[PDB]
RNA sequence: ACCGAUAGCGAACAAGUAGCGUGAGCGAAAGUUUGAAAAGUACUUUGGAAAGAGAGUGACAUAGAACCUGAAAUCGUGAC
RNA sequence: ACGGACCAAGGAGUCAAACAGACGCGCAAGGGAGGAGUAUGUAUGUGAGAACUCUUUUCUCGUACUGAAAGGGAGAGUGUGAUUUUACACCCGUGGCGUGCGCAAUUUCUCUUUUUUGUGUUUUUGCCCAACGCCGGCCGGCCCCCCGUGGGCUGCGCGCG
RNA sequence: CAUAAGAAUUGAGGCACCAAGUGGGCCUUCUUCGGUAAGCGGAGCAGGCGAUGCGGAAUGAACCGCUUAGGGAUAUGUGG
RNA sequence: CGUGAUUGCCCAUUAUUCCUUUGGUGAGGGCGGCUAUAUUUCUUUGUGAGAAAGUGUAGCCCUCCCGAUGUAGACGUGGCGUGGGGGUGAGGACGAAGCCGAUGGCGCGAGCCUCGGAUGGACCCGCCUCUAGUGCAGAUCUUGGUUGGCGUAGCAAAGAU
RNA sequence: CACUGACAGGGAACGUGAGCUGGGUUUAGACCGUCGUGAGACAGGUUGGUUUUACCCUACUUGGCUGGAGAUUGCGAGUAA
């Protein structure tokens, strides 16, 4: 069976690339089941100092305080035994997914174990599957500062190809401007607009082909 | 199903008919051409070359070519859902200029000539009448009809 | 993928849309290549003309590497060439240096009209370079 | 359109179209399918028949998937969800997915009747 | 059958030796490959560990190497060149002990 | 039971489905090919000519940009 | 009694609840659809429409073939209007032939990296159509580039009763000598 | 990202068994009491006997060992 | 004419190469790696066929074709001189069409807007047509033969990547 | 484009890509061949049927009328 | 006289007309940040009650139009079901699921929903994506099953209690 | 041939096999003559050569063997002189 594939390299990546932006296109992120009452900077960019935290509790707590409560609480707790047969092909339990910390690399203690889908990543990864639950993107990346910064070096820029992927980078927007719609409203455009209609309702003939008093 | 020569014959068509036998006239030869002429096709017999197959007498096409002895006529031949242009290699002897078109143009110019004259040349100059109409009538002797049998003994079959 | 397949759309339906006429069972009525000459002629002739027979001539044990490709034509090169160069050398007071090999090829056939004399350490050329390179004051160096 | 008022009936039938002879074979079931049926009078729209469903019959697009009490039933399992509905009076009545066990109905029901907005569960048969 | 105008008469798997309810047979999928990769890898690394004092790759020459298509190219080829090795000076046997390849069938053009 | 040959009926009906075509006949211009070679030789010499008309399609261009460029 | 339709319920042909997966377009069209009709502008409408098609149906265009267009300016006017607007609903690929050609303004879907740059770099301007339209409503000294179409290869593979009239290359298996091409390049076998 | 007891190996089962065929060989069928457990219905009493009716048990015996469910075809009944 | 006593559960258009179209989809004369291999922790593991890749070498197919060959081979740019071997110049081959762009008349509108009219004009990459021209090809023409001004038949070729 | 005298149309045209499904037909006005003939055979034209029903012909594949969204209201069709 | 009693009709899926439906290379429009547009309608010869009166109105909605049988065959689905994946609904023993239901209803339908247990009793389902050993009357289908057939045929040799 | 008033002709899936029968018919065996090179053949000859099922539906025969409609009332007046 063609249990297998190619993907084009530019494309696989490119895609992810759209995704990365959309990892911080917040509505999307919220929409993504991500919640944080906590919500503030999108992405909420965090000390890399965090990474060294070695007691689970310590770490988590701040993390909770700083965010992790709802989404996290969806996590662990939306855990269900997989109903249906996948269970009986060993998929016994299912659960959703909650917010992402990306590490430059991990060095806490615990470190942060006992919880996957509640991401942690050594940057040089970024796995779309983790990035896009159900291929339906939007996740909260919680930055280590060191990841955060490193990131850019990773994608280069549009007009500055070169990273560690060779030329592959931020590259062209199509239309340069969203809020097109806004744009579309204009004034120039709005001037050249063409004027309209009037005189409405109540019919002209109001049947009667036959003469009469009507 | 039937036998097929590319010159397969007929009863009474190709045969060179009613006192119409013999060579083409010198008038035929004195003719003169240009191309693009819409000329119609006929078959002498004379020489059995430059001679189309059956389709073609009674058809009008246009010449595209003049070769030594002959002329090229492209004709639209109707096949299936179309007419295809076929360019046929006749020696001159088997083709002639119509009037088909002649009139149209002839009139058109003549008329233009008049239309132009009428404005914008000097004169001015009646032609025709309308179509068809009514009328006063002062006739002066109507009849009727009484047919057959009276004085049938004078006439009819036996 | 399963769901797209016609089949899905085509059940309760016997023929599989094959036609109610034509209860064309699972056999060839044909089969692979052959029979091209009788019952498929018109097609065969038509759609793959020049087949069969064999004629012209042959080179047994041919070893195609040995021919492996060599050709480039002109403007082509400049593009490969650093734009700096290509927006500069023109005059003939700087002939930038092009080694064909990296470009691949080996042979130069005409075309192009360039936009700087340069050096192409080039391996073979059409007639035209004597009239092109040369005309240009561009250059060929044949390899040695 | 319905009520008040169009000038005639709201369907031409809706008694389900089935096969024919369903009635006959008991292992045969009563579901609507297109006759294939080569000589089929059923295909052939000969007179003797029963009906088929067709786009000419359709319910007025404006006036369709609308209840009797004028609402589309809207599926609900809970009070939060229900709390969203509030605006609506036009075209939905929430229907509680009865389909999920009860205790919560004790909660939903309490809130909903309390919240003064329809649910058929909460409005049908001998209890509210 | 459907009307679609697509790329004429094809598709291939419905041919020879694809073992059916028959049996056969000439089988050699690559699905092992992950595992294989690992097999190469895991081993390779693990090998290193063992060998360990040793510089791994064994010196060999450099060559320009074949063809036309390769006429212009160099690869570090097999072997060495005893002659060269000689020319640097070095007993081949000894060289082998050092872990620098040797050769013969390098005729040395 | 005598096993019938063939026929033509339905055909003008079939032929008229898809109609009866000619193609814009004289395309706007001919379909090419053939003629009398002494004439064909001569016509090329009056199409020599084309390089003359290409310098007439350039004559106008020059006039616009030499009259004034303002 | 109905009667002939010249073909009944008139076929997709040129299309409606429409095409590809790029989001932007979807806007564009909303934007533009007003504009051609309700900013009465054939050009706009055209634009609008022109936006709609599929990829083939948006086969590219490339630069030097625009050069010419900017020879057109040059035989246009002494020059009161002294400016000009290019459109291409595809990518602009670089060409080659010139490549010392001037700067100028091109309004495209996409300009290659190289091109984009180099164009712009040459004083050109790559404007996306957002970057056009908005600041360009209404034509006039607009230049529709309607792409190409023709020079695809596909049509090559249209034709094979190899009569003296049909000269066309089949989708066959010789990529070298014979392998289905043995005569024709000799008159003789299986004639012409 | 397999199947779900007619599936799935032949074979979930004392199965490559049983069985079958001279033999070569051929080679099946066949799943689950218990909110927890036999607590597996004492006892009464009729009943040759089975058994019954009681009783007795147990949430539940429309759970009494044919044990989860218990589909349909088919039939008695009730009821009409 | 056949098949069809009944009810459960079964019970039939699959995977899949090159390939043609269609369509989305990537990038674009390159593209596609591709085989592999390295590679460093998330930490089971790890220095992810499948994670992330990541890639120098490139490989491979693609970005001129033509000839059996031997073999050649495309702005025969354009233009130009041109007795155009050449030699010069260096921001559209020739014509037919062209959404377009221009102009004027044309309505109102202050002007704008500008309805409407009337035209102009523009590369055959906007499409196609129509004709050279061009590559390999073939006859080598013109002529008595052969060569040059120049031919003159032909082709999956080329004509503004 | 007037005549002074002689269309109508033109619910687009142009133009194309590519794949199906089909190759036993049968019925008819008309013409017509074979043969006594044949509800026979065998062609020509148009139309059907086929592959549609509705309405008519007590009965009818092809005769009459007429073709079909779903209805409603009205009037006709053939036919009474 | 001059017509006139006065009204010759009956009756198809055709026709008209009218509605609703549906499709359409279909027409309109409103498509605004309070002018307006749909919903509901008064006081009811010249009213949108912006202010009489409730309700809806972010590119769709709201009006308009032509057409609308079709086998084979084809195409379409902001069509329908299912098995399973990924995401997302953390849906429930206050009894899952299964199942029965002259139970109702929604949807042209395909389904889908609902309300019942004198049901059944624990795992199971929504929605968006993925993805399929994916939707049966017939195959002289198949396995199982289930009949009627019908207490009918029939139990009638080998001498007999 | 014989009788006889009389020895008409027909129809009924060429009426008429779950009627028989099997002499006719057409296999196989087997003889001959012919023909055939041949095997074989032969619409030549010859000869011997496996004729099932009803219990069912219906149909037919006998044998048993049971009512009435419905309307203002199937809501009641139980021919009509």
From Swiss-Prot, chain G:
Q: Where is this region: Disordered?
A: 157-192
The principal location of this protein is cytoplasm
UniProt gene name: RPL18-A
Where is the protein found, in the record's own terms?
Cytoplasm
Q: Where is the composition biased (Basic residues)?
A: 182-192
Q: Can the keyword Membrane be found in this entry's annotation?
A: no
Q: Name one GO biological process term.
A: translation
Q: Is Metal-binding set as a keyword in this record? A: no
The name of this protein is: Large ribosomal subunit protein eL18
- What Pfam families does the record point to? Ribosomal_L18 (PF17135)
Give a GO molecular function annotation for the protein.
Answer: RNA binding
Please state which protein family the record places this protein in.
Belongs to the eukaryotic ribosomal protein eL18 family.
Q: Which SUPFAM superfamilies match?
A: Ribosomal proteins L15p and L18e
Q: Which UniProt keywords apply?
A: Cytoplasm, Ribonucleoprotein, Ribosomal protein
Q: Which GO terms describe its cellular component?
A: cytoplasm; cytosolic large ribosomal subunit; nucleolus; ribosome
User: Which InterPro entries does the entry mention?
Assistant: Ribosomal_eL18, Ribosomal_eL18/eL18-A/B/_CS, Ribosomal_uL15/eL18, Ribosomal_uL15/eL18_sf
């Amino acid at each position: 069976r063609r249990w297998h594939r190619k993907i084009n390299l530019h494309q696989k990546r490119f895609a992810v690339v759209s995704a990365l932006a959309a990892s911080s296109l917040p509505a999307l992120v919220m929409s993504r089941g991500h919640k944080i009452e906590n919500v503030a900077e999108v992405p909420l960019v965090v000390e890399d100092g965090v990474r060294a935290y070695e007691k689970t509790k310590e770490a988590m707590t701040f993390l909770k305080t700083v965010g992790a409560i709802d989404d996290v609480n969806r996590v662990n707790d939306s855990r269900q035994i997989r109903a249906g047969r996948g269970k009986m092909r060993n998929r016994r339990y299912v659960a959703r997914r909650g917010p992402m910390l990306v590490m430059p690399d991990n060095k806490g203690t615990r470190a942060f174990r006992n919880i996957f889908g509640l991401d942690l990543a050594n940057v040089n990864s970024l796995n779309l599957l983790h990035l896009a639950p159900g291929g339906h993107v939007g996740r909260f990346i919680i930055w280590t500062k060191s990841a955060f910064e490193k990131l850019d070096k990773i994608f280069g820029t549009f007009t500055e190809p070169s990273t560690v992927k060779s030329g592959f980078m931020l590259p062209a927007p199509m239309l340069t401007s969203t809020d097109v719609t806004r744009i579309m409203q204009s004034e120039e455009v709005r001037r050249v607009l063409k004027p309209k209609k009037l005189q409405p309702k109540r019919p002209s003939r109001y049947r009667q082909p036959t003469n009469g008093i009507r | 199903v039937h036998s097929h020569g590319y010159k397969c014959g007929t009863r009474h068509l190709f045969a060179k008919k009613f006192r119409k036998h013999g060579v083409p006239s010198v008038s035929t030869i004195l003719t003169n051409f240009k191309v693009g002429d819409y000329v119609d096709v006929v078959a002498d017999a004379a020489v059995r070359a430059g001679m189309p197959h059956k389709y073609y007498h009674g058809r009008t096409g246009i010449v595209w070519n003049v070769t030594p002895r002959g002329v090229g006529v492209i004709i639209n031949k109707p096949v299936r859902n179309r007419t295809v242009r076929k360019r046929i290699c006749v020696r001159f002897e088997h083709v002639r200029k119509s009037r088909c078109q002649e009139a149209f143009k002839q009139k058109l110019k003549d008329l233009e000539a008049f239309r132009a004259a009428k404005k914008a040349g000097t004169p001015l100059p009646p032609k025709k009448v309308s179509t068809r109409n009514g009328g006063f009538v002062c006739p002066k002797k109507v009849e009727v009809l009484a047919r057959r049998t009276a004085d049938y003994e004078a006439m009819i079959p036996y | 993928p399963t769901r797209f397949k016609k089949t899905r759309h085509q059940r309760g339906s016997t023929f599989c849309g094959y036609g109610r006429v034509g209860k064309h069972r699972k056999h060839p009525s044909g089969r692979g290549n052959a029979g091209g000459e009788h019952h498929h002629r018109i097609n065969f002739r038509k759609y793959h003309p020049g087949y069969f027979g064999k004629c012209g001539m042959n080179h047994y044990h041919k070893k195609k590497n040995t021919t492996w490709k060599p050709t480039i034509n002109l403007d082509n090169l400049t593009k490969l060439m650093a734009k700096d160069e290509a927006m500069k050398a023109k005059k003939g007071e700087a002939l930038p240096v092009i080694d064909l090999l990296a470009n691949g090829y080996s042979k130069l056939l005409g075309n192009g009209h360039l936009q700087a004399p340069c050096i192409v350490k080039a391996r073979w050329v059409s007639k035209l370079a004597d009239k092109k390179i040369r005309k240009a004051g561009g250059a060929v160096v044949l390899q040695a | 359109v319905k009520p008040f008022v169009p000038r005639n009936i709201v369907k031409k039938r809706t008694k389900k179209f089935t096969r024919h002879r369903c009635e006959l074979f008991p292992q045969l079931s009563s579901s609507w399918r297109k006759p294939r049926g080569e000589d089929s009078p059923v295909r052939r729209r000969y007179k003797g028949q029963k009906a088929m469903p067709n786009k000419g019959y359709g319910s007025d697009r404006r006036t369709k998937y609308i209840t009797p009490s004028g609402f589309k039933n809207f599926p609900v399992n809970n009070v939060q969800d229900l709390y969203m509905l509030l605006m609506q009076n036009r075209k939905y009545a929430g229907v509680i997915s009865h389909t999920v066990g009860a205790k919560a109905r004790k909660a939903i029901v309490r809130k909903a009747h309390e919240l003064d907005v329809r649910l058929i569960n909460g409005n049908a048969k001998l209890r509210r | 059958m459907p009307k679609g105008n697509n790329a004429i008469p094809h598709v291939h798997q419905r041919k020879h030796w694809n073992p059916c309810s028959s049996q056969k047979g000439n089988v050699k999928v690559f699905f092992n490959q992950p595992a294989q990769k690992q097999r190469r890898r895991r081993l390779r690394l693990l090998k290193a560990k063992k060998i360990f004092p040793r510089p791994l790759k064994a010196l060999r020459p450099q060559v320009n190497c074949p063809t036309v298509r390769y006429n212009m190219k160099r690869r570090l080829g097999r072997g060495f060149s005893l002659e060269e090795l000689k020319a640097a000076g070095v007993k081949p046997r000894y060289a082998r002990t050092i872990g620098i390849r040797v050769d013969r069938r390098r005729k040395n053009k | 039971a005598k096993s019938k040959n063939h026929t033509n009926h339905n055909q003008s009906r079939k032929n008229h489905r898809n109609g009866i075509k000619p193609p814009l006949p004289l395309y706007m211009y001919n379909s090419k090919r053939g003629g009398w070679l002494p004439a064909l030789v001569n016509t090329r010499r009056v199409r020599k000519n084309n390089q003359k008309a290409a310098l007439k399609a350039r004559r106008e261009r020059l006039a616009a940009h030499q009259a004034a460029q303002k | 009694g109905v009667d002939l339709t010249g073909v009944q319920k008139k076929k997709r042909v040129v299309r409606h609840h429409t095409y590809s997966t790029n989001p932007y377009i979807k806007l564009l069209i909303k934007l533009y659809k007003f504009l051609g009709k309700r900013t009465n502008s054939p050009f706009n409408k055209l634009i609008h429409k022109r936006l709609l098609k599929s990829r083939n149906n948006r086969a590219p265009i490339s630069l030097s073939r625009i050069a010419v267009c900017m020879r057109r300016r040059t035989v246009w006017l002494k020059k009161g209007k002294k400016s000009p607007i290019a459109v291409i609903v595809g990518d602009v690929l670089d060409d080659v032939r010139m490549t010392r050609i001037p700067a100028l303004r091109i309004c495209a879907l996409r300009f290659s990296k190289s091109a984009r740059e180099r164009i712009t770099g040459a004083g050109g301007e790559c404007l996306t159509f957002d970057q056009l339209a908005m600041m360009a409503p209404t034509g006039k000294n607009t230049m529709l580039l309607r792409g190409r179409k023709s020079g695809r290869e596909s049509v090559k593979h249209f034709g094979a009763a190899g009569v003296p009239g049909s000269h066309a290359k089949p989708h066959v298996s010789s990529r070298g000598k014979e392998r289905q091409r043995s005569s024709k390049r000799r008159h003789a076998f299986r004639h012409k």
